[PDB]
Design a protein around this nucleic acid. Structure first.
Ligand code: MG
Ligand code: MG
Ligand code: MG
Ligand code: MG
Ligand code: MG
Length: 756
DNA sequence: GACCACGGCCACA
DNA sequence: ACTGTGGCCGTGGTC
């Protein structure tokens, strides 16, 4: 199983290292033959001699062009004659590429910025994380001595915890009498001890939670001060720091540092992403938090260090469990993209399609288009039309079915051969024409994008079959991961075609896809109402809810089964309207806000406040209860009882203040805010007391009793003292709870007055 | 100083 | 930095 790749230098020449795990043991393959290269497009091939003599400067050494090969690749499906420029070392390309672009006779250079070791995974057609090879893992967290107004890592590391299959344990340089605590003297002896434990266990994966930004950085600083060789690398190297936009990530050569924080950021949507919050969300059991002030006071008085030892042990223990939950799927995603788990677990879904496409393009000798320059980025701000959204037949409904298209946009791309290399291609013998936008798409040959999407969705269906037949339990959920990941990857290809900074940007393709989706959807909505007598209640991009007025459920079910047969014969190619589900009732508020109820009894909520992070828990709780009271029982008078009870509780300040917290993210530099809402009024006051407020910070505030601007009297919930503060009951009654339940109960003639 | 457009956040498909 | 479509509110600007 390939685990990562990099390269070292030997007498100037680069050497690819493939970090594998084969037949139970770690091993390193070395390749001294792979040469670095990029392509160049010339006016006349004669100029190759002027450019083969281009020169530049790096490391006090002159970078020159090794050799040049003339090759034929495709660019936009067209036969193009390009010049392959080889170099001796990867670091030659930055030093000389910009000087090459500016030569008179070069139209453009391509694929000039692909990391050498990632280039290798592609050019050699190798796949990380392939095989049944099981990986030995190890989580670790640290405790620190924090004082306000101190430099980062001014204080020592107090505890180092680690967990795996064998259990959780804490090293610490003070006596705590707990069976899982290993005591040493000095923190230098705990760090060397941790190195001893990691080196002995030789784990394939080191799982942290924000170890990209705290744990490894703190360990580094301490190791510099105490003169410790912090050689976690399987080659004996120290952790390597890379830039991650305005952040950092840490490599451990020969291993996979799997930081769970970015992974869980994208995979789960939570109000706050503390280790304790994420653990409760994922496993249903709560995790207790002890704070830095608690930890420092415990360490310097020597008292109650055992609860700090328990916190550190749990940090590692729960970090191992989340590692086991989130790693296998991310290892399947690594397999799909053809990039290392370290990279993929730190990449956006938008970044990954480029890597997948890059690999496919190389498979098909297709010259990857360059990333856009800033002038083209401005030509790419033209907008287009998206999905059709119907104003819901606002109110409550009976016996409704949801019909949705199977992968509407991929079906469209495949069926009509939508690709930048098929758009308005001249001299074809068969075309399809997009509605409204009128873009013609050649069909003589399958295009780049439709070929991959077909291979992808074909593979996904193969996977799902072998899965349902698989006789191994792990391989089952592995295959389950692969096909689930293929579905997400398929429907990010449309988003790519419209993305500002996408290599295969094609606005004409992107708007042709949405145009076809709107035609097909509004057509089926027309046919189901006219031919079959339904009424479409609400329709977003690729589906709709509908029923037959004053009709049975069995009548709605069977007749809808009929309409599916009728409409799927009318639908061309891979388009397919399917029967997603039946629901006994459903309330529809506005566009993007509804909630339906199974005949088994499960409620599904969409877009309403119940699903919103930035709404108080008391409002979401109470609205939920009002939904159940209606969808489950039609008890319009139980719903009003709920609201009157809740408002009475708030007015008596009887509601737990924990339910009144509002979570809003910071998205930019506070310098750059033009409008200051309450959460950025809190933030600006926090930074004024020296708190790091970066993009991503989840402000969590409460509104205290008073008058005037909400922001002027909102405080962080970190600082709510029920003996020194009264929350603003009037705000949470009148500006949170009532407005949320009222949008629903207005359909039955209830004003906010009727809800007390 | 009542009325409102709207930065700004997050949801949906 | 995957897309477009959309609801909602605290805030300050407006005649
Ligand atoms: Mg790497
Ligand atoms: Mg930490
Ligand atoms: Mg058509
Ligand atoms: Mg955009
Ligand atoms: Mg829909």
């Amino acid at each position: 199983m390939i685990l990562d790749t990099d390269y070292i230098t030997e007498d100037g020449k680069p050497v690819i290292r493939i970090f594998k795990k084969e037949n139970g043991e770690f091993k390193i393959e070395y390749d001294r033959t792979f040469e670095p290269y990029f392509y160049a497009l010339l006016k006349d091939d004669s100029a190759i001699e002027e450019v083969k003599k281009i020169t530049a400067e790096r490391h006090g050494t002159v970078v020159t062009v090794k050799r040049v090969e003339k090759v034929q690749k495709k660019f936009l499906g067209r036969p193009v004659e390009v010049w392959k420029l080889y170099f001796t070392h990867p670091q030659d390309q930055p030093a000389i590429r910009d000087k090459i672009r500016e030569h008179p006779a070069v139209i453009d250079i391509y694929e000039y910025d692909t990391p050498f070791a990632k280039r290798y995974l592609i050019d050699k057609g190798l796949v990380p994380m392939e095989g049944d090879e099981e990986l030995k893992m190890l989580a670790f967290a640290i405790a620190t001595l924090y004082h306000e107004g101190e430099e980062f890592a001014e204080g020592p590391i107090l505890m180092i915890s680690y967990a795996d299959e064998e259990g959780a344990r804490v090293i610490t340089w003070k006596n705590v009498d707990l069976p899982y605590v290993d005591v040493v003297s000095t923190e230098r002896e705990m760090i060397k001890r941790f190195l001893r434990v990691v080196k002995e266990k030789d784990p394939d994966v080191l799982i942290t939670y924000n170890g990209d930004n705290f744990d490894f950085a703190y360990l580094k600083k301490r190791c510099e001060k105490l003169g410790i060789n912090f050689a976690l690398g399987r080659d004996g190297s120290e952790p390597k720091i890379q830039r991650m936009g305005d952040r950092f990530a840490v490599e451990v050569k020969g291993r996979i540092h799997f930081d769970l924080y970015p992974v869980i950021r994208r995979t789960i949507n939570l109000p706050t992403y503390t280790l304790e919050a994420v653990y409760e969300a994922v496993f249903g059991q709560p995790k207790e938090k002890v704070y830095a002030e608690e930890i420092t006071t415990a360490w310097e008085t020597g008292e109650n260090l055992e609860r700090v030892a328990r916190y550190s042990m749990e940090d590692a223990k729960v970090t191992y469990e989340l590692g086991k939950e989130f790693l296998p799927m991310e290892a399947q995603l690594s397999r799909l993209i053809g990039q290392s788990l370290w990279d993929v677990s730190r990449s956006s879904t938008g970044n990954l399609v480029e890597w997948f496409l890059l690999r496919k393009a190389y498979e098909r000798n297709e010259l990857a288009p360059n990333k856009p320059d800033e002038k083209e980025l401005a030509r790419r701000r033209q907008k287009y039309e998206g999905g059709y959204v119907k104003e819901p037949e606002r109110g409550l409904w009976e016996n409704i079915v949801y019909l949705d298209f199977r992968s509407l946009y991929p079906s469209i791309i495949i069926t009509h051969n939508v690709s930048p290399d098929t758009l308005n291609r001249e001299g074809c013998g068969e075309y399809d024409v997009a509605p409204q936008v009128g873009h013609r798409f050649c069909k003589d040959l399958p295009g780049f994008i439709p070929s991959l999407l077909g291979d992808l969705l074909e593979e996904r269906q193969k996977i799902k079959k072998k899965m349902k037949a698989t006789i191994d339990p792990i391989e089952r959920k592995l295959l389950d991961y692969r096909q689930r990941l293929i579905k997400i990857l398929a429907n990010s290809v449309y988003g790519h075609m419209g993305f500002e900074n996408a290599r295969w940007y094609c606005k004409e393709c992107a708007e042709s896809v949405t145009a076809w989706g709107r035609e097909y959807l509004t057509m089926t909505i027309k046919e189901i109402e006219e031919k079959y007598g339904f009424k479409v209640i609400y329709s977003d991009t690729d589906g709709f809810f509908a029923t037959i007025p004053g009709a049975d459920a069995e009548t709605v079910k069977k007749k809808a089964m009929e309409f599916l047969k009728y409409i799927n014969a009318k639908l061309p190619g891979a388009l397919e309207l399917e029967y997603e589900g039946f629901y006994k009732r459903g309330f529809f508020v506005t566009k993007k806000k509804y909630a339906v109820i199974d005949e088994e009894g499960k409620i599904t909520t969409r877009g309403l406040e119940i699903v919103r992070r930035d709404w108080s828990e008391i409002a979401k709780e109470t609205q939920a209860r009002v939904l159940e009271a209606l969808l489950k029982d039609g008890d319009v008078e139980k719903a009003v009882r709920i609201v009157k009870e809740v408002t009475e509780k708030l007015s008596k300040y009887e509601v737990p203040p924990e339910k009144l917290v509002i979570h809003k993210q910071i998205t930019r530099d506070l310098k750059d805010y033009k409008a200051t809402g309450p959460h950025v009024a809190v933030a600006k006051r926090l930074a004024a007391r020296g708190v790091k407020i970066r993009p991503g910070t989840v402000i969590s505030y409460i509104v205290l009793k008073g008058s005037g601007r909400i922001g002027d009297r909102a405080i962080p919930f970190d600082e709510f003292d029920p003996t020194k503060h009264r929350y603003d009951a009037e705000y949470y009654i009148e500006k949170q709870v009532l407005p949320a339940v009222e949008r629903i109960l207005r359909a039955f003639g209830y004003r906010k007055e009727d809800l007390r």
